[PDB]
């Protein structure tokens, strides 16, 4: 599929992040189109193009790699850098996770070459051990035959054809970027103090990110070079979370409503109730992750009593219900 087709399908499952969708879609299309050309008639070799994802926690960076992978039949695995993954006392090498990707593809190394292995919390290993993980991860990011010998006879697959996507919720990266391009002091009468509950311009500032900023953050120059493609994700505003409740195809509201439709009872969420859930979700700082937990708990009381209650046609939830003032109104019939 061409990049345009990829963009059309991915925007249905995930909303927002228009800029991240354009760069991410082109990166995957360029890498896969090269792999499909296994013959490589031209003497020029095809090199991998690693992708880098930067954005605030809960912005959906992980959901972008997993959802995009689902569009294709290739396997997708995930790893965490907070454990200091490595083949030694530093931690547990992600090589085992690579074998997991191979297992998903009926344990076929040929198909495993199209892996989309993603490493999360990459910003947690920034140099202040921390630098040791980055150094050992330089070769793995690029082509390297060395790896854990599989047990299905011992083979040695190379990590050059498997795409690598590293993304982490960098903390404080917006401060260094501002001090580079943006002017003005941070302390003083003339300083431009950014409101914590207003003026969410962090997403726009992240777009103006260059390799120099990552150097000061702690990442060694070698690691940055391994990741040529760079992408940014903007924070989801209070209104953005509201759209995630209905616009996404597999949204929370659509899932719960469909479940109730099985017993013949249809539930409808009004616009007033959706905004009420979004405002409290922002305070919890859980982002979109906590939206499913809060919404489920709100309707959990009536959901348990719904199957037992008789003479029910369709239920409805009001804004006051979310606040706990009343309970979902039921229309007898």
């Amino acid at each position: 599929p061409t990049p345009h087709e990829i963009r059309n399908h991915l925007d249905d499952y995930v909303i927002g992040q228009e800029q991240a969708k354009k760069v991410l879609a082109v990166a995957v299309y360029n890498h896969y189109k090269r792999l499909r050309n296994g013959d490589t008639s031209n003497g020029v070799e095809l090199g991998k193009s690693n992708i880098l994802l930067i954005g605030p926690t809960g912005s959906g960076k992980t959901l972008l790699a997993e959802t995009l992978a689902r569009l294709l039949d290739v396997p997708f695995t995930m790893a965490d850098a907070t454990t200091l993954t490595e083949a030694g006392y530093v931690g547990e090498d992600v090589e085992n996770i690579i074998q997991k990707l191979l297992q998903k593809c009926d344990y076929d190394v040929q198909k495993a070459q199209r892996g989309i292995v993603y490493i999360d919390e990459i910003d947690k290993i920034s140099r202040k051990s921390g630098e040791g993980v980055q150094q050992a991860l330089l070769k793995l990011i690029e082509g390297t035959v060395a790896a854990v010998p599989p047990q299905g006879e011992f083979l040695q697959v190379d990590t050059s054809k498997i795409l690598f996507i590293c993304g982490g919720a960098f903390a404080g990266l917006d401060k260094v970027i501002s001090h580079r391009v943006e002017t003005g002091s941070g302390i003083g009468f003339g300083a431009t103090v950014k409101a914590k509950s207003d003026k969410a311009s962090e997403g726009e500032l992240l777009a103006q990110v260059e390799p120099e900023d990552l150097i000061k953050f702690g990442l060694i120059p070698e690691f940055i070079g391994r990741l040529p493609v760079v992408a940014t994700l903007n924070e989801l505003s209070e209104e953005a979370l509201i759209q995630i409740l209905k616009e996404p195809k597999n949204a929370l509201t659509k899932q719960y409503q469909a479940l109730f439709n099985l017993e013949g009872v249809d539930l409808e969420f009004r616009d007033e109730a959706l905004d009420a859930i979004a405002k409290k979700a922002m305070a919890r700082k859980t982002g979109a992750r906590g939206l499913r937990s809060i919404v489920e708990a709100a309707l959990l009381d009536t959901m348990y009593d719904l199957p037992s209650m008789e003479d029910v046609e369709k239920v409805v939830i009001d804004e006051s219900v979310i606040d706990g003032q009343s309970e979902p109104l039921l229309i007898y019939g």
Binding site: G186, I187, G188, F189, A191, V193, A195, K196, S197
Partner: protein, 192 residues
């Protein structure tokens, strides 16, 4: 000697002093006669706290007999300029500039100890020289007196005439009397 306290955190042990530890929790101290050096130090602390978090309240304990009026005006402007609300608590005593800063805190966040005392008096000055120079200085001090009275009435809520009459001479008011006058809101006797 300033005792050195240690704060336990995930990163590790950190070295701090008694004053620095409280400063990290948005707490400021105003001890000793008000002057240009000490006043400037307080202003710097307020600016630093605002940048860290422009929403959390900034506390400031006022315990001093007063000092230079000009040095005290800078602190007042900073309190009314920074978005965070400045909570002022009177400890020991607050006279002259100290009393003015006590009532300059955000409405509904002014407190005082049960045994705290607040004294208010008119500005004190004086100049020597030629007759023309003395006249200029006399007018300057008079203007400062009027401005201070207006600001006091704005916070305490009393009339301008009432403030002027009460400022003609030193007036000592205990903590219970301060609440009624309007300088403070409540009294912190015990922690509940």
């Amino acid at each position: 000697l300033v005792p050195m306290v240690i704060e336990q955190t995930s990163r590790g042990e950190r070295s701090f002093d008694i004053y620095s530890r409280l400063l990290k929790e948005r707490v400021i101290f105003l001890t000793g006669q008000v002057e240009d050096h000490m006043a400037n130090l307080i202003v710097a602390q307020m600016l630093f706290l605002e940048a860290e978090n422009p929403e959390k309240d900034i506390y400031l304990y006022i315990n001093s007999p007063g000092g230079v009026i000009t040095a005290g005006m800078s602190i007042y402007d900073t309190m009314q300029f920074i978005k965070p609300d400045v909570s002022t608590i009177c400890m020991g005593q607050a006279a002259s500039m100290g009393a003015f800063l006590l009532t300059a805190g955000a409405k509904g966040k002014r407190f005082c100890l049960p045994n705290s005392r607040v004294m208010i008096h008119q500005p004190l000055g004086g100049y020597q020289g030629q007759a023309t120079d003395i006249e200029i200085h006399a007018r300057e001090i008079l203007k400062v007196k009027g401005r201070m009275n207006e600001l006091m009435a704005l916070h305490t809520g009393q009339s301008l005439e009432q403030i002027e009459r009460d400022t003609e001479r030193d007036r000592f008011l205990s903590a219970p009397e301060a609440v009624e006058y309007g300088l403070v809101d409540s009294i912190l006797t015990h922690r509940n």
